[PDB]
Amino acid sequence: FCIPIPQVYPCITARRVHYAFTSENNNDSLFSTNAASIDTAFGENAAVS
Amino acid sequence: DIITRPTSDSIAAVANATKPAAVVSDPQSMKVTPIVNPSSYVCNVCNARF
Structure with missing residues (x-):
């Protein structure tokens, strides 16, 4: 699988081509994103549950 | 036969002046295999x- 790295500022993203993606929510192993920064601007804004 | x-010198100078590159390289290009x-x-x- 290919996943974009979450960014901390509003960026300009190039249009990308994707083909694969699952059918359920198999995302439980994700802990947090941009932990060291103040906020996630573009990517998946995951936070500690 | x-x-x-040959074309006049003046118009040739103008034409050659305006010639943007037809193939520019940039990172955001929407690549498609x-x-x-x-x-x-x-x-x-x-x-x-084969």
């Missing part, structure tokens, strides 16, 4: 590849 009377793989070629009848 053919001939070619070929639909059919150009590497291998398959015999459509006996499926022999």
